[PDB]
Amino acid sequence: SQKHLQINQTFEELRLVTQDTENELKKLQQTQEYFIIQYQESLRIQAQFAQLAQLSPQERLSRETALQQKQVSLEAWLQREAQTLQQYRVELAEKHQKTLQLLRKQQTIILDDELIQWKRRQQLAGNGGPPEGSLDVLQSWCEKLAEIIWQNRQQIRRAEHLCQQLPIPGPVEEMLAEVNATITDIISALVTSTFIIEKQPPQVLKTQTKFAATVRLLVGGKLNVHMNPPQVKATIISEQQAKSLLKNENTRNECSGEILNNCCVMEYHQATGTLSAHFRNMSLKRIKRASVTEEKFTVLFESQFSVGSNELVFQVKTLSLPVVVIVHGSQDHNATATVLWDNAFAEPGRVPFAVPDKVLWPQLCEALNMKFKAEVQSNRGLTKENLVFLAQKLFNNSSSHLEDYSGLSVSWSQFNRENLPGWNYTFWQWFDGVMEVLKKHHKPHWNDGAILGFVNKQQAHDLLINKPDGTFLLRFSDSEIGGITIAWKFDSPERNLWNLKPFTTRDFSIRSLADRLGDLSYLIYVFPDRPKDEVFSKYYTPVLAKAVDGYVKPQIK
Numbered sequence: 001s002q003k004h005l006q007i008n009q010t011f012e013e014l015r016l017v018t019q020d021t022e023n024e025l026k027k028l029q030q031t032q033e034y035f036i037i038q039y040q041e042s043l044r045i046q047a048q049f050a051q052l053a054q055l056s057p058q059e060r061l062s063r064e065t066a067l068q069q070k071q072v073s074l075e076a077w078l079q080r081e082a083q084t085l086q087q088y089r090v091e092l093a094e095k096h097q098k099t100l101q102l103l104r105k106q107q108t109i110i111l112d113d114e115l116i117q118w119k120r121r122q123q124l125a126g127n128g129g130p131p132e133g134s135l136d137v138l139q140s141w142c143e144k145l146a147e148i149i150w151q152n153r154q155q156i157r158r159a160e161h162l163c164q165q166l167p168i169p170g171p172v173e174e175m176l177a178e179v180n181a182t183i184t185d186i187i188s189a190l191v192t193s194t195f196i197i198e199k200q201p202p203q204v205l206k207t208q209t210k211f212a213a214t215v216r217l218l219v220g221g222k223l224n225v226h227m228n229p230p231q232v233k234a235t236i237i238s239e240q241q242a243k244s245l246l247k248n249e250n251t252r253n254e255c256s257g258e259i260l261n262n263c264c265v266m267e268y269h270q271a272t273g274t275l276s277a278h279f280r281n282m283s284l285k286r287i288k289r290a291s292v293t294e295e296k297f298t299v300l301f302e303s304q305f306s307v308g309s310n311e312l313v314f315q316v317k318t319l320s321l322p323v324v325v326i327v328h329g330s331q332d333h334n335a336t337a338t339v340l341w342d343n344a345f346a347e348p349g350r351v352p353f354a355v356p357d358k359v360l361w362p363q364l365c366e367a368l369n370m371k372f373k374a375e376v377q378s379n380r381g382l383t384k385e386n387l388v389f390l391a392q393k394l395f396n397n398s399s400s401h402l403e404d405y406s407g408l409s410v411s412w413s414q415f416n417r418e419n420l421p422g423w424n425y426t427f428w429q430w431f432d433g434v435m436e437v438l439k440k441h442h443k444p445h446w447n448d449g450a451i452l453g454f455v456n457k458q459q460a461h462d463l464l465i466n467k468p469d470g471t472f473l474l475r476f477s478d479s480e481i482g483g484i485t486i487a488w489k490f491d492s493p494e495r496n497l498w499n500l501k502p503f504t505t506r507d508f509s510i511r512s513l514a515d516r517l518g519d520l521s522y523l524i525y526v527f528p529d530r531p532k533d534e535v536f537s538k539y540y541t542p543v544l545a546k547a548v549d550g551y552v553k554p555q556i557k
């Protein structure tokens, strides 16, 4: 891939230049060590002058002049090697600065781009979007970042220890403080950012229901963390409690309810190299709520762990995607609309649960189509024609051209607060009502094309006129939520086009949609041409004999 293999180039380049500094560090370590032994030779030259100063000037003539020559040269060498030791120290800090600034570039790419892309993909998958996929790619990149930063951290620890053993003043001290300032800044960011929720908890959480979540740390294996697997504490929080948590204005263990099994320990898995806490049996015990259906909450996962050193401790916190809490499950219907809006229209880097008031119509379309396909479980989504029908209903306009609605904004109030033109419901109620009846028992029929649905009473009439005396279509009724009305043709005294009473799921519980179509004589050709028993053959109930009626084997009528 494009910037996928570009990452690997600037990753390998980091490992190469980090090895060059490793070579220069072991080299300087030797240069210094020799210099220390040579300095003791300079000290030992003087003590030699004392034992030399005993005998006659017959021996002292040669001894004192040779010892002077050896002391001058060694003293000039020690003085030049002393500058060399300092110059080399600087060149190592310059190199360490260079590989760290380059490491920051690669860090930001992994964390602020590829990670955010994964998290956005995850966000939209809540609304039915495409799956975000495995973290494998980002774990490998995070491990590299963790490894390279750790290597550079221990290198500058060793570089520092040499300086304390042999101090040389100047720029070195300040440049070393700067590399350390950067080194901690990089690890802190790397640590906090890779404590992520792999499998988010249910966004429409029903009280007293077993739910699950999975919080992975991407730098578990490649750092001194899996050795002591840390305890992770799940905690339900409010939208205000989250805005405070992020601005650092929290007050102790502030929260909004109890969670059974809200504590779990991370597990290290060899081969996968993954450190992950799978909260398999969580459950909501109670809630706080100072609309109920428009109330955002979040599962706050926290943990504390050390990274090798006893001093090096980090406190990690990650927030779940906003969840709406329900108790009776009856209001799942409206909860879904708030979650839908949030998952679709959340702005990157927003303050906790900041969604826009209005959005342009085709933005909302994208979302409705996304969720629609996902719910009815079919590849047949909302066509440009169906999109016009919903634009007509929502905006209360007459136009049949989709491009007309392009600049129009749907507010949250227009979507699921104020009711439609002359109805006892909102657009989301009508739309979700339709997905619900389809999903509940019409998934095959929708997929098979047998339910045109998104056509108005007029649209249906200006279609079945030019059709034989039994042609009919299936339509979504505007008056009865989740209702499917039949539009058919049959020439009689006054009327020749007819709209039968809409069927609600109640009616479908008694007799099937297919059992009801086959039950009616007049209905004989499904629109446009297709015969009735051709489209609904499959779904016809083969009346099976009862046991009470005395049948030893399964029989049909």
Ligand SMILES: CN(C)C(=O)CCN(C(=O)[C@@H]1CCCN1C(=O)[C@@H](NC(=O)c1cc2cc(C(F)(F)P(=O)(O)O)ccc2s1)C(C)(C)C)c1ccc2occc2c1
Pocket: 457, 476, 477, 478, 479, 480, 485, 498, 499, 500, 501, 502, 503, 504, 507, 516, 519
């Ligand atoms: C074996 N079998 C299944 C039967 O018994 C079949 C017999 N049947 C009928 O013919 C019933 C009996 C009463 C009148 N009737 C009708 O069919 C009449 N139709 C209506 O009364 C209405 C049509 C619409 C359409 C909309 C709408 F288009 F969707 P909108 O866009 O405004 O929402 C809304 C309200 C209404 S009221 C008639 C066709 C005009 C004669 C009938 C019985 C119990 C039913 O329960 C559900 C459907 C249904 C069907």
